[PDB]
Amino acid sequence: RYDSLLQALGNTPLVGLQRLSPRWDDGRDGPHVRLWAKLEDRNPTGSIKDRPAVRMIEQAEADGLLRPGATILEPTSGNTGISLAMAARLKGYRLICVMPENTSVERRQLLELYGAQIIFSAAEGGSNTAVATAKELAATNPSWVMLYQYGNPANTDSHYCGTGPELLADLPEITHFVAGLGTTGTLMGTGRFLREHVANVKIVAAEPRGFVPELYDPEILTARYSVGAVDAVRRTRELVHTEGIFAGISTGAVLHAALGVGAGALAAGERADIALVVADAGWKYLSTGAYA
Amino acid sequence: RYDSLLQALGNTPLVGLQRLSPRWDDGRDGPHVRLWAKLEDRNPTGSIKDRPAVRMIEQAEADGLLRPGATILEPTSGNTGISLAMAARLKGYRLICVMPENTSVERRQLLELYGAQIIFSAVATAKELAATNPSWVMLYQYGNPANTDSHYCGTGPELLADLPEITHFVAGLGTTGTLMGTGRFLREHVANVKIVAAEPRVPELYDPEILTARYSVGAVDAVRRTRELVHTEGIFAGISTGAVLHAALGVGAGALAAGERADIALVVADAGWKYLSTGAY
Numbered sequence: 001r002y003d004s005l006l007q008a009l010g011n012t013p014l015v016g017l018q019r020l021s022p023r024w025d026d027g028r029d030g031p032h033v034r035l036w037a038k039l040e041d042r043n044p045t046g047s048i049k050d051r052p053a054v055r056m057i058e059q060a061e062a063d064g065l066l067r068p069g070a071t072i073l074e075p076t077s078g079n080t081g082i083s084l085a086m087a088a089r090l091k092g093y094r095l096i097c098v099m100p101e102n103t104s105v106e107r108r109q110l111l112e113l114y115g116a117q118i119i120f121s122a123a124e125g126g127s128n129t130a131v132a133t134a135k136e137l138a139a140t141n142p143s144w145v146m147l148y149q150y151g152n153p154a155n156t157d158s159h160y161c162g163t164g165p166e167l168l169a170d171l172p173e174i175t176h177f178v179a180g181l182g183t184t185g186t187l188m189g190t191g192r193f194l195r196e197h198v199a200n201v202k203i204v205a206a207e208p209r210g211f212v213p214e215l216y217d218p219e220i221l222t223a224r225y226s227v228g229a230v231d232a233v234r235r236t237r238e239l240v241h242t243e244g245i246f247a248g249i250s251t252g253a254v255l256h257a258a259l260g261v262g263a264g265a266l267a268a269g270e271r272a273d274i275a276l277v278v279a280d281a282g283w284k285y286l287s288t289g290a291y292a
Numbered sequence: 293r294y295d296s297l298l299q300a301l302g303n304t305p306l307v308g309l310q311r312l313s314p315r316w317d318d319g320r321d322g323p324h325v326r327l328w329a330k331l332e333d334r335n336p337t338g339s340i341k342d343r344p345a346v347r348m349i350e351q352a353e354a355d356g357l358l359r360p361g362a363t364i365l366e367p368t369s370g371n372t373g374i375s376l377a378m379a380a381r382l383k384g385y386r387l388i389c390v391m392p393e394n395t396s397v398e399r400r401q402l403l404e405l406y407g408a409q410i411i412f413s414a415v416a417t418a419k420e421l422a423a424t425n426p427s428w429v430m431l432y433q434y435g436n437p438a439n440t441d442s443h444y445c446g447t448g449p450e451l452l453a454d455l456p457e458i459t460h461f462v463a464g465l466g467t468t469g470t471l472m473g474t475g476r477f478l479r480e481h482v483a484n485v486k487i488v489a490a491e492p493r494v495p496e497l498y499d500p501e502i503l504t505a506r507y508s509v510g511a512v513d514a515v516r517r518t519r520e521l522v523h524t525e526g527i528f529a530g531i532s533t534g535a536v537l538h539a540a541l542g543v544g545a546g547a548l549a550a551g552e553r554a555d556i557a558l559v560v561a562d563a564g565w566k567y568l569s570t571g572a573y
């Protein structure tokens with residue numbers, strides 16, 4: 001049991017995808033190629049961002065960067081903002097988010113429900129514009145505390161100390177780890193941990209079809225897949241149809257990459273155990289029509 | 293690790309509500325009065341109905357009542373239908389849900405995404421259709437003892453294991469499975485434990501002996517409490533949780549006024565996602 005929602009975080013289930021996996025059982029045709037889904041919607045606000053959000057705040061608190069009642073400022077496409085907003089309610093901080101104006105209405109509603117102030121940056125330039133806008137706001141008011149999810153090592157550390165160790169415990173036979181590439185925390189932290197323990201482990205990024213996050217270490221990745229929106233939608237729908245998991249759009253892209261890695265292993269007669277991140281659920285994407 | 297999403301069900305967390313509790317810590321004014329929230333949104337389709345749904349299906353399979361490719365029929369306001377739809381997808385059954393009109397659109401969207409067929413306007417309608425089509429399987433959540441069993445065998449034990457000092461259990465009263473199953477378990481194991489319903493202001497599962505209290509809760513109070521929970525504890529709960537929290541706070545204020553220790557467990561049956569379209573948030 002836990003003393004607050006903040007602690008009911010991580011230790012997420014890993015579920016074998018027996019129908020979607022290229023080959024679930026070993027046999028006469030060759031070795032198994034299995035997919036394993038780590039369900040990061042089993043978290044306080046329903047996404048993986050709860051891990052770095054909470055660790056970024058707590059580390060900021062430890063470093064004396066946050067006095068009680070402080071106002072936090074963060075550029076976000078939504079998930080990090082929501083996680084931070086939750087954490088800010090339990091810890092007594094105010095929150096200002098800079099979010100692109102072309103984000104789903106669900107994200108907006110949930111941030112307002114948590115009492116975050118939202119500044120909607122121009123759609124054009126997307127997250128680059130959000131980040132640049134937040135830097136301009138940080139400079140107009142230095143009392144505001146920007147944790148900076150694209151450069152804060154506590155982001156990466158949450159996956160190094162959490163996501164990675166959880167994966168190795170549940171899946172010591174892991175051959176591949178597949179996840180989306182955004183802040184880069186998930187892949188950098190989980191990947192660094194897994195490469196220290198698992199000999200020839202492959203770390204595979206899925207990214208949408210500039211601005212390089214400061215967290216990014218190019219030596220960590222084996223490969224990067226670019227996935228178009230149509231394939232991401234297709235795989236998201238396919239995951240709920242075949243395995244019952246109602247995931248967000250990034251999971252479709254990750255799945256697309258993982259099935260590619262999977263098809264490659266199968267065609268080469270190689271055993272594979274491919275862990276893939278389900279970073280959030282489908283709820284915040286319903287208004288997009290992608291599940292229609 | 294798990295083999296299927298169906299297995300990643302239950303063993304939900306219990307979270308202390310330090311801010312909303314009448315008194316978290318023992319002090320000179322008297323003993324603690326604690327609220328503990330069991331997060332049943334941490335489940336395959338995001339609600340407590342995953343427990344009875346999966347158990348009803350698996351019990352119908354073992355009993356031989358349910359054969360490959362069968363059509364399943366169920367009257368539902370959404371949560372049960374969603375749970376069944378997910379499980380029917382995995383197990384290869386067709387699902388028809390009989391629902392009221394004015395169900396939130398998020399419900400219909402997720403039902404259709406899982407491939408469920410929706411028929412509007414619910415129990416009587418389902419019963420007629422089932423009678424007309426004897427090969428359809430109507431599990432019937434209002435009277436199937438696998439619903440209650442799912443809580444007697446899951447929710448109850450998990451709660452006792454995490455909260456052996458429990459004095460009260462509070463939940464919504466719908467099919468009555470949660471309170472009958474959890475409540476019977478708790479009353480058979482914990483001396484003088486109290487079992488408290490919240491209902492909005494008769495299923496064959498209901499047993500009049502189990503409940504020690506029941507509170508009717510108005511919509512405005514339910515909404516207020518739901519909003520209060522998210523503002524104060526960070527938990528984004530559905531509306532039933534508001535009503536449940538209303539009852540739990542009432543019971544907690546009683547214990548505080550009486551100077552008695554209380555450890556009150558309450559069910560968060562689902563999250564807020566499906567209720568955004570209602571404006572309540």
Ligand SMILES: O=C(Nc1cccc(C(=O)O)c1)Nc1ccc(Cl)c(Cl)c1
Nearest residue numbers: 076077078079080180182207208250253
């Ligand atoms: O990278 C993200 N999300 C993201 C990145 C950085 C910050 C945030 C945030 O919630 O603030 C979200 N999603 C993602 C990542 C990769 C792919 Cl392929 C797709 Cl489709 C989506």
Ligand SMILES: O=C(Nc1cccc(C(=O)O)c1)Nc1ccc(Cl)c(Cl)c1
Nearest residue numbers: 368369371372464466490491492532535
């Ligand atoms: O009882 C329900 N929901 C319910 C009952 C029966 C069936 C279903 C279903 O998902 O089909 C849902 N919710 C509930 C229960 C108690 C209160 Cl006070 C409030 Cl506000 C809501």
Ligand SMILES: *Cc1c(COP(=O)(O)O)cnc(C)c1O
Nearest residue numbers: 079180182183184185186250279
């Ligand atoms: C953040 C996020 C990602 C990418 O994770 P990073 O650790 O930021 O690279 C993928 N999908 C979703 C839904 C996210 O919120």
Ligand SMILES: *Cc1c(COP(=O)(O)O)cnc(C)c1O
Nearest residue numbers: 371464466467468469470532561
């Ligand atoms: C079913 C349900 C309840 C009531 O539980 P029963 O076991 O049916 O009495 C309460 N809240 C929500 C959100 C539900 O789906």
